Design a protein around this ligand. Structure first.
Ligand code: J9P
Ligand code: OLC
Ligand code: OLA
Ligand code: OLA
Ligand code: OLA
Length: 444
């Protein structure tokens, strides 16, 4: 095929891939080193690492492909020894699997953040995410080093412009392993992305999710530190030690026979009741009432959060902080709240609350604005792009293992070219398209 064999493909592919990935890295560096409030620096860390992984993979492969075209093909002439072909095979496989596993790591992380928000906020440290991206790399590099040892081999592919995984036992096992490793990556990505979208639709009110991150959600009847029956977001059922008395208390509050188990919607209903009662306490308190009225809906949630943690009297003791809230001295009020025994006992919770009072945003807890639909469309796009670009290669390889005269050589070049396109689209899908086309979103 005179059409498929052209130097115009690697030239335009390298050009588009280079610009996108070098710029994605530049924007990530400007957005991460800021030192603000949110610990979502790990999401920037993954995108930044993905851009680097994609850029290096293109810089190491494409110049060789260009050189063989200029020399008038015959890879075996330019490389009589097996060094460049095995190296090319290695660099194609290590950077190919790394892109798919980083895409999967992000999918898993987003899913954990939304499906288990309480556990995510306390268990992370950021050092774990940096170690995972290092570990994934070494595990992939070790697998890619198998033909060097003896398991499988890297051969010259049609039209003699590139090298890849060859398709008795060693060659077939190494090829099958790559095929199943690639399909596992796509299945893990699709599953976590579908789970995330489903959960974004299920999301409750902004107050509900705020206290879920701070206190946690339990849908089964459990005992607290004092031994009292509790459910949902810290809702005490009864002070009686009887389990029967607790199940009948929950059944009265809900309506139906729950038998210790409830739904997120029912937990939100019990939470909304607790919100009504805490507002009653605030309005009845002489000191908390003028503060509550002067504050906006977002800042009121930060006050309700404090009342849930310390109680009506506990919050009232912060006389100096409350006076600054009505006077709208947000920066000064933050300092006085930080100078407390509460801040030292629960540093992560106090930091998220103080930021909500200071900025008047949900930023410390998450997005939840118009970004909730923006993320849904972005996750949907990932699944579409990843499947069209990476499925033909993976299916072609499984077909080759299962065993002009054949037109498989022509389609295999189309298949690897599509898989290479995924690492050109990556900076656009994950960062650049949102950062550039952020204005037409408000227009539409
Ligand atoms: C198998 C998946 C590898 C994907 C990768 C890790 O991202 C590396 C691909 C790099 C491409 C780049 O995107 C432009 C280029 O040239 C590289 C090799 C393309 C395959 C060989 C085709 C040879 C030809 O054009 O005749
Ligand atoms: C010859 C081949 C020509 C290249 C084909 C298509 C490039 C366009 C691909 C657009 C990728 C979809 C991105 C999208 O629309 O989703 C929104 C975005 O992810 C929100 O952040
Ligand atoms: C606005 C988003 C930017 C997207 C840029 C698109 C980059 C496309 C670059 C090169 C085309 C790659 C060719 C892959 C198709 C394989 C078919 C073939 O070999 O004929
Ligand atoms: C020739 C190359 C063929 C082009 C292949 C893939 C382009 C990807 C199209 C992405 C459309 C996104 C659809 C969506 O999620 O709404
Ligand atoms: C999952 C979706 C996979 C869909 C299609 C796999 C690509 C089909 C490969 C057969 C092409 C061989 C040929 O040229 O006849």
């Amino acid at each position: 095929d005179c059409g498929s064999v052209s130097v115009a493909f690697p030239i335009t592919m390298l050009l588009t891939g280079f610009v996108g990935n070098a710029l994605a890295m530049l924007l990530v560096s400007r957005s991460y080193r800021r030192r603000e409030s949110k610990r979502k620096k790990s999401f920037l860390l993954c995108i930044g690492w993905l851009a680097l992984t994609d850029l290096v993979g293109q810089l190491l492969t494409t110049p060789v492909v260009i050189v063989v075209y200029l020399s008038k093909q015959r890879w075996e002439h330019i490389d009589p020894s097996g060094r460049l072909c095995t190296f090319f095979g290695l660099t194609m496989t290590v950077f190919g699997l790394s892109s798919l596993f980083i895409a999967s790591a992000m999918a898993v992380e987003r899913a954990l953040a939304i499906r288990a928000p309480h556990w995510y906020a306390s268990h992370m440290k950021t050092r774990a995410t940096r170690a995972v991206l290092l570990g994934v790399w070494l595990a992939v590099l070790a697998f890619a080093l198998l033909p060097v040892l003896g398991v499988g081999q890297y051969t010259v592919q049609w039209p003699g412009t590139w090298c890849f995984i060859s398709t008795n036992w060693g060659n077939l096992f190494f090829a099958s392993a790559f095929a199943f490793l690639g399909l596992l990556a796509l299945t893990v990505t699709f599953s976590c992305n579908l789970a995330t979208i489903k959960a974004l639709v299920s999301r409750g009110s902004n107050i509900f999710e705020m206290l879920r991150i701070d206190e946690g959600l339990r849908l089964k009847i459990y005992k607290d530190t004092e031994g009292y029956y509790t459910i949902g977001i810290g809702h005490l059922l009864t002070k009686s030690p009887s389990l029967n008395a607790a199940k009948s208390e929950l059944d009265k509050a809900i309506g139906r026979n729950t038998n210790g188990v409830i739904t997120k919607d029912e937990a939100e209903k019990l939470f909304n009741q607790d919100v009504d009662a805490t507002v009653r306490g605030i309005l009845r308190n002489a000191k908390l009432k003028p503060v509550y009225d002067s504050l906006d809906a977002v800042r009121r949630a930060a006050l309700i959060n404090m009342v849930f943690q310390m109680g009506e009297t506990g919050v009232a003791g912060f006389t100096n902080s409350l006076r600054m809230l009505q006077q709208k001295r947000w920066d000064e009020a933050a300092v006085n709240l930080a100078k407390s025994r509460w801040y030292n006992q629960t540093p992560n919770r106090a930091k998220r609350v103080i930021t909500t009072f200071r900025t008047g945003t949900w930023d410390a807890y998450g997005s939840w604005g118009r970004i909730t639909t923006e993320t849904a469309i972005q996750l949907m796009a990932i699944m579409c792009v990843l499947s069209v670009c990476w499925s033909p290669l993976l299916i072609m390889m499984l077909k080759m293992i299962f065993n002009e005269k054949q037109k498989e050589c022509n389609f295999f070049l189309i298949a690897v070219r599509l898989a290479s396109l995924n690492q050109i689209l990556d900076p656009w899908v994950y960062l650049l398209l949102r950062k550039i086309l952020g204005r037409p979103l408000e227009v539409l």
